Design a binder for this molecule. Structure first.
Ligand SMILES: [K+]
Ligand SMILES: [K+]
Ligand SMILES: [K+]
Ligand SMILES: [K+]
Ligand SMILES: [K+]
Ligand SMILES: [K+]
Ligand SMILES: [K+]
Ligand SMILES: [K+]
Ligand SMILES: [K+]
Ligand SMILES: [K+]
Ligand SMILES: [K+]
Ligand SMILES: [K+]
Ligand SMILES: [K+]
Ligand SMILES: [K+]
Ligand SMILES: [K+]
Ligand SMILES: [K+]
Ligand SMILES: [K+]
Ligand SMILES: [K+]
Ligand SMILES: [K+]
Ligand SMILES: [K+]
Ligand SMILES: [K+]
Ligand SMILES: [K+]
Ligand SMILES: [K+]
Ligand SMILES: [K+]
Ligand SMILES: [K+]
Ligand SMILES: [K+]
Ligand SMILES: [K+]
Ligand SMILES: [K+]
Ligand SMILES: [K+]
Ligand SMILES: [K+]
Ligand SMILES: [K+]
Ligand SMILES: [K+]
Ligand SMILES: [K+]
Ligand SMILES: [K+]
Ligand SMILES: [K+]
Ligand SMILES: [K+]
Ligand SMILES: [K+]
Ligand SMILES: [K+]
Ligand SMILES: [K+]
Ligand SMILES: [K+]
Ligand SMILES: [K+]
Ligand SMILES: [K+]
Ligand SMILES: [Mg+2]
Ligand SMILES: [Mg+2]
Ligand SMILES: [Mg+2]
Ligand SMILES: [Mg+2]
Ligand SMILES: [Mg+2]
Ligand SMILES: [Mg+2]
Ligand SMILES: [Mg+2]
Ligand SMILES: [Mg+2]
Ligand SMILES: [Mg+2]
Ligand SMILES: [Mg+2]
Ligand SMILES: [Mg+2]
Ligand SMILES: [Mg+2]
Ligand SMILES: [Mg+2]
Ligand SMILES: [Mg+2]
Ligand SMILES: [Mg+2]
Ligand SMILES: [Mg+2]
Ligand SMILES: [Mg+2]
Ligand SMILES: [Mg+2]
Ligand SMILES: [Mg+2]
Ligand SMILES: [Mg+2]
Ligand SMILES: [Mg+2]
Ligand SMILES: [Mg+2]
Ligand SMILES: [Mg+2]
Ligand SMILES: [Mg+2]
Ligand SMILES: [Mg+2]
Ligand SMILES: [Mg+2]
Ligand SMILES: [Mg+2]
Ligand SMILES: [Mg+2]
Ligand SMILES: [Mg+2]
Ligand SMILES: [Mg+2]
Ligand SMILES: [Mg+2]
Ligand SMILES: [Mg+2]
Lengths: 133, 211, 148, 159
RNA sequence: CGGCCCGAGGCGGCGGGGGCGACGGGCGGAACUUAAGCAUAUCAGUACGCCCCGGAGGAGAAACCAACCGGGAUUCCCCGUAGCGGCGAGCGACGCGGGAGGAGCCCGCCCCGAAGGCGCGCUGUGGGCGCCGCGAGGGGGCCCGAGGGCCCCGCCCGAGAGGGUGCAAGCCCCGUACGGCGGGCGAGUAGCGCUGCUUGAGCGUGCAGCGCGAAGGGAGGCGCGGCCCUUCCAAGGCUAAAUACGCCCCGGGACCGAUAGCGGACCAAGUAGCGCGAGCGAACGGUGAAAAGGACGCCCGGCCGCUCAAAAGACCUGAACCCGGCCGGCGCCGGCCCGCCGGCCCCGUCUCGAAACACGGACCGAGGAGCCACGCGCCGCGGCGAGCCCGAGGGCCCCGCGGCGGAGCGAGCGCGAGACGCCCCGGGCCCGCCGCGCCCCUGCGGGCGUGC
RNA sequence: GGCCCCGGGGGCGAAGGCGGCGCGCAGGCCCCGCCGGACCGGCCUCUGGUGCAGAUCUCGGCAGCAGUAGCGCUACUCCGCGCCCCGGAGGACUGAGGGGGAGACGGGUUCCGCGGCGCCUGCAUCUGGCCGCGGGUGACUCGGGCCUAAGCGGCGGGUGAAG
RNA sequence: GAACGCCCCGCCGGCGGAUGCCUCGGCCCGGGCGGCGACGAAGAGCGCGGCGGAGCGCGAGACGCGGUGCGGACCCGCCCGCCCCGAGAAGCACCGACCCUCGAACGCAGCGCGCCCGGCGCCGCCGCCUCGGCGCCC
């Protein structure tokens, strides 16, 4: 049961917030679980999906694994390499079947200066909570 | 609503019915016209509340508490009490903070099947009510009544469970649906202060027992 | 509750108990109380004698707490004595330790005489007495008294 | 609105801790024939009441007493009842882990009446033999005197 | 020729003006309507027009109320009849009592005279809540286009509020529970006379014009003159709180669900469109999980067929009225298996009387009319009972005044009920009002009687 | 608001739609087949904007009538692949108060060139004031700016509760 | 007779948009807040994008410019551009500027003209400069 009275529990307002969200909120809402192997190494549970990661898909009719070529933030979907619409011609181009990030599990992460730091920032706060508890 | 437009009757002599019409001839301003007002609009001055005397409010709580001391009326209200030691069920707990420990007591006594009865019943309701913030329904289980011990943190999350401090007992909790016989889990200090509570009501005597 | 009302039993009846010959119109007698001396005179004389006219003196501003005047009968006097003490007083019909009852403390001014008292001396202090309240009190051995 | 007012007087009480939220107000008689014999809370204390204990108006306002210089005492009992009320409060006051007093300070309480005893013989010498005639002579005294004068001038004119 | 007085033009610094569908203050000010007609009255000191502020405003520290064994500035809440009136219809305050809140002061006059804010002033200055962030825990088997489904075994819970995700998810993802930062006392006056408006204010509630014009004065719900008593000090000024409210932001709901709900759910509504103008003012929501939004071939738009679970193909479902192709047959009720026999005027309505040459109605769909608030009477049921009671307010629980009932009658001074009775009805007697024998004390007062 | 005995029915197919049996004096209810593709209830207590054939009812759709009633300004024809467009030849009309050539007012891009026929051009169209894409109006001397007409504003102030 | 019309013994098509389910919208109650303007408001006009009509936004510095923080891979089409332990796309909050014509609307007018080489409206308060009077005096 909720206790905070500045937070809506109204379906109409909650649905309006899923749409019409700004771009920084939409990125966070497109997260996925890290694999067990990365959970031990990084000590984090989920991560926001990104162009350049490798994902293992389940629960769908397009199961498989591949790299993230595109992010359709308006749709909350991601295009993976190798997961296409079944095509008509033998020659014609591939057409990506778009996957929802929560149907995925990340197997390897794209790394740069900002992604190392935001992980380390998130571990130190999760250790504040583990000291309070 | 319905009266922001401008409309007047055309009168007889033009082969049309006599209701008010907008410029152009469109029907307006009647309950039988598209876009018109209601015949008698709803108003907030409806009397929403009702009065009850203080004597009759105390009778209802006492009669609803007496129903809770029968194992045949609790059963016929809907609960599962076939594995319970006593239906006037008093239990010594004295402090409960983890839900895991509080689940262990309710099992350790025999009210485990009533909370699973409630847990496995959650569903989406049948009508328009699921657009109006009333989307799910669960059945109602035990009521824990406490006096001086922290139990609310460990009991509250359980499906179909409610919490009452003994000094202020609620009739809408004792008779869900307007049916009297709820199953009640008394803490020891709650059950042993019932008479003190009824002694704290000034110039009140309980009603006379009958056959 | 709308669902137990007489008016919902008339769906399908063309006219909801108001008749075909007469019907339901706006105000076939006028509004309010009008007509009491002309076409409702048979009603006003049968049930409201003394509705029309004037009677008596008028006071441009009445003092509500001057004209206030509470009263008590002598048959209610012994109930002002608490029950724990009444038995003993009756037991010893004393002339030299009689009970004193001051009725203004209980909020009465005048003492009237309906009823009767027990055979027991008692003293009653008030602001005014009726003539047979005094007579029945002296019949018992009691005394009346005036108080500030 | 009930929650708003309770919140306003919780904040005000911290800002004056440990002063109470109320001033000490006097005990006065409810005003009419219908309500005398019982007391209630008044507006302020008089300067004659304040002269009794030894406080000036500015001095008593400082330690929590309300002072109403517009009121005048109507009797000697009005003074003794309120001087005793002033004297008592000065005992239970400390001037600088301290206790803030709730509600009205020294509430006014009106006693339920009691029965008393006496002697029949010492109460008779208080009253005449016919009390009802005694009352009826006083009630009609002005009216009888007017009719008495009217008759007396019916004969001076009629020689 | 300088000073003072009364004016003129210019220059510098500073201030004003306009704006708002509420709440607030000041003015001007209707008619419809009701009275079963209509003039006074009512609607209403309302609509609407003009002016002026603020975050509140206005009001305010007695020329007050009262008649007490008295209260004590203003505002707001609970509570209840004096009176006004073609005395008709209607209209209508307030004190006492219970609570919220509580706060008190100044100038003029008088004393000192520039001690002051010093180009001025002696025609008088100065003193007396919002910003951050972490955030637990589910697998295996059947099946489907797709598992949030079914079967069987578990974990988290200070978190089973909820939203998303290809079909009902605590454990797939965001959140939810548990916490850190900033924090000596007023004059063209008061009053009075005449006149107009206003009020419950009644030989004047409040205001105003004009004429007159005080010294101790004002008030005490019926006028005038006299004597007392009780209680206040007008004609100058400031002041927090408790109270009211749209736009806009935030939360909630036994509310509406696309002819409903705002006129306005639709990338472009006060929009398109109409009127010289003031102004008037619509209609239109929905493919699919994914645009995968339609292959290859054959004839010269069609065919075949491709994507997809499915064309769902310009889109969900897709009723009625009405219509086209193939197949069968030639109004309601009743009997018989079946085209014969028997019965049958057009409904709704007003009306003594309708099939009427009395009126409404081509057809079909959706919408479409005794609900709510307050007051009065009677009946039923619940609780308690000479008592009863969730006022307002204060701490679905606890505490909580009036009020109504308990005694009536009388214009009023006022006086004031026991004697009977299962119940009901009647009789008799007692209380008040109107009359009258008789006796007496404290006396046009008491007692005891008689009568409508 | 409750219950629906291991916790009510549902993609192994909900609500709705179309036909067909049964049950009830009746209002109505229940089942089956086909369609449809995501939600729905039986019993107890509570609540109301709660039931249509009619109102010259309101809004929307739409039939017969019915391939019906109907389509001033003298006029076109031959050939060019040929349309009422374009060309050539013929025949006529407006008839200098013009069906001619130009301005004022009003309209506002209708002007021009190239393309085109989905809408419009009440028949047709290859035409066009229609649709798409590009373009287009040059002043010392012409008009407006200036002057005053009939008028209309302003004016220390005056008046009115104000405007 | 056939056909037309009518009924339906059934199987398919049209026209129309009811019913059912769905909802970034309304409505009701409560809580906050009470924050405009000559330092040019509210409102109106015109203009501004690489390909640009409407609406939102902005003002010739125009579909935005700067500064401090935060954030960390995108930017709906076609292009551009960014990409990295900082090199920095989307997004967010505060702060500093730019700010065409009309409007209380301010040189006159409303689109045309002046006086003067800074500029150039009305009212009021306080000061100051320069002055008038057969007002009272000298
Ligand atoms: K209107
Ligand atoms: K009509
Ligand atoms: K009509
Ligand atoms: K009660
Ligand atoms: K209760
Ligand atoms: K009737
Ligand atoms: K009749
Ligand atoms: K009438
Ligand atoms: K009438
Ligand atoms: K009458
Ligand atoms: K009279
Ligand atoms: K008026
Ligand atoms: K009127
Ligand atoms: K009239
Ligand atoms: K009238
Ligand atoms: K009148
Ligand atoms: K009137
Ligand atoms: K009348
Ligand atoms: K108080
Ligand atoms: K998922
Ligand atoms: K004077
Ligand atoms: K005067
Ligand atoms: K009046
Ligand atoms: K009168
Ligand atoms: K005069
Ligand atoms: K008097
Ligand atoms: K008066
Ligand atoms: K008077
Ligand atoms: K509409
Ligand atoms: K009729
Ligand atoms: K008729
Ligand atoms: K007739
Ligand atoms: K008929
Ligand atoms: K006929
Ligand atoms: K006929
Ligand atoms: K008729
Ligand atoms: K006729
Ligand atoms: K007819
Ligand atoms: K009388
Ligand atoms: K025809
Ligand atoms: K062309
Ligand atoms: K004036
Ligand atoms: Mg009409
Ligand atoms: Mg409507
Ligand atoms: Mg339904
Ligand atoms: Mg009938
Ligand atoms: Mg009918
Ligand atoms: Mg009638
Ligand atoms: Mg009649
Ligand atoms: Mg009728
Ligand atoms: Mg100036
Ligand atoms: Mg009206
Ligand atoms: Mg009338
Ligand atoms: Mg009438
Ligand atoms: Mg009339
Ligand atoms: Mg009035
Ligand atoms: Mg103020
Ligand atoms: Mg009047
Ligand atoms: Mg003031
Ligand atoms: Mg609508
Ligand atoms: Mg369809
Ligand atoms: Mg008639
Ligand atoms: Mg007729
Ligand atoms: Mg007709
Ligand atoms: Mg309908
Ligand atoms: Mg409803
Ligand atoms: Mg209705
Ligand atoms: Mg119909
Ligand atoms: Mg000719
Ligand atoms: Mg052209
Ligand atoms: Mg044509
Ligand atoms: Mg020229
Ligand atoms: Mg634009
Ligand atoms: Mg200008």
């Amino acid at each position: 049961m909720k206790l905070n009275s500045a937070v809506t529990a109204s379906r109409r307002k909650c649905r309006k917030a899923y749409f019409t969200a700004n771009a920084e909120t939409r990125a966070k809402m497109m997260s996925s679980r890290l694999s067990k192997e990365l959970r031990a190494e990084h000590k984090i549970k989920t991560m926001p999906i990104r162009r350049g990661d490798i994902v293992e898909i389940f629960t769908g009719g397009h199961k498989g694994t591949g790299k993230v070529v595109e992010v359709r933030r308006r749709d909350y979907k991601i295009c993976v390499e190798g997961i296409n619409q079944k095509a008509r011609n033998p020659e014609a181009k591939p057409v990506p079947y778009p996957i929802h990030p929560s149907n995925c599990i990340i197997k390897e992460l794209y790394m740069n200066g900002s992604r190392y730091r935001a992980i380390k920032r998130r571990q130190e706060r999760n250790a504040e909570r583990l000291a309070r508890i | 609503a319905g009266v922001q437009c401008t409309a007047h009757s055309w009168g007889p002599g033009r082969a049309v019915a006599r209701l008010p019409r907008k410029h152009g001839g469109i029907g307006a301003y009647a309950n039988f016209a598209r876009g018109g007002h209601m015949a008698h609009p709803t108003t907030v001055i409806r009397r929403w509340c009702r009065k009850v005397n203080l004597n009759q409010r105390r009778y209802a709580v006492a009669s609803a508490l007496a129903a809770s001391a029968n194992a045949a009326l609790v059963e016929a209200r809907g609960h599962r009490i076939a594995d319970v030691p006593s239906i006037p069920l008093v239990v010594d707990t004295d402090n409960v903070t983890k839900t895991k420990d509080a689940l262990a007591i309710i099992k350790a006594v025999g009210v485990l099947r009533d909370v699973e009865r409630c847990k496995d019943s959650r569903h989406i309701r049948a009508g328009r009510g699921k657009m109006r913030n009333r989307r799910y329904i669960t059945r109602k289980g035990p009521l824990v009544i406490y006096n001086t011990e922290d139990v609310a943190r460990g009991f509250r999350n359980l499906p179909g469970v409610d919490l009452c401090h003994v000094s202020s007992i609620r009739l809408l909790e004792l008779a869900p649906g307007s049916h009297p016989g709820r199953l009640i889990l008394w803490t020891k200090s709650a059950f042993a202060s019932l008479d003190d509570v009824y002694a704290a009501k000034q110039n009140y005597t309980l009603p006379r027992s009958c056959i | 509750p709308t669902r137990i009302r007489k008016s919902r039993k008339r769906r399908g009846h063309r006219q909801m108990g108001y008749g075909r010959v007469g019907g339901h119109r706006k105000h076939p007698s006028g509004r309010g109380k009008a007509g009491g001396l002309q076409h409702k005179r048979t009603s006003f004389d049968k049930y409201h004698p003394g509705y029309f006219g004037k009677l008596g003196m008028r006071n441009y501003h009445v003092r509500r707490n001057i004209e206030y005047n509470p009263t008590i009968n002598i048959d209610k006097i012994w109930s002002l004595i608490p029950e724990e003490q009444r038995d003993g007083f009756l037991q010893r019909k004393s002339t030299t330790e009689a009970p004193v009852v001051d009725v203004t403390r209980f909020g009465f001014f005048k003492v009237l005489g309906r009823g009767s008292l027990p055979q027991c001396p008692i003293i009653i202090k008030a602001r005014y007495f009726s003539s047979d309240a005094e007579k029945k009190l002296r019949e018992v051995g009691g005394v009346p008294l005036l108080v500030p | 609105r009930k929650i708003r007012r309770r919140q306003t007087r919780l904040q005000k009480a911290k800002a004056i801790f440990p002063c109470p939220l109320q001033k000490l107000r006097p005990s006065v008689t409810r005003c009419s024939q219908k309500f005398n014999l019982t007391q209630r809370i008044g507006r302020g204390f008089t300067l004659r009441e304040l002269q009794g204990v030894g406080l000036s108006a500015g001095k008593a306002r400082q330690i929590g007493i309300a002072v109403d210089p517009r009121r005048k005492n109507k009797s000697e009992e009005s003074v003794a009842r309120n001087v005793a009320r002033l004297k008592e409060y000065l005992s239970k006051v400390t001037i600088f882990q301290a206790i803030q007093h709730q509600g009205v300070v020294m509430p006014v309480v009106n006693p339920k009446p009691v029965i008393t005893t006496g002697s029949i013989a010492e109460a008779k010498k208080e009253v005449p033999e016919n009390l009802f005639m005694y009352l009826r002579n006083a009630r009609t005294a002005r009216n009888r005197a007017r009719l008495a004068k009217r008759d007396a001038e019916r004969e001076a004119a009629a020689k």
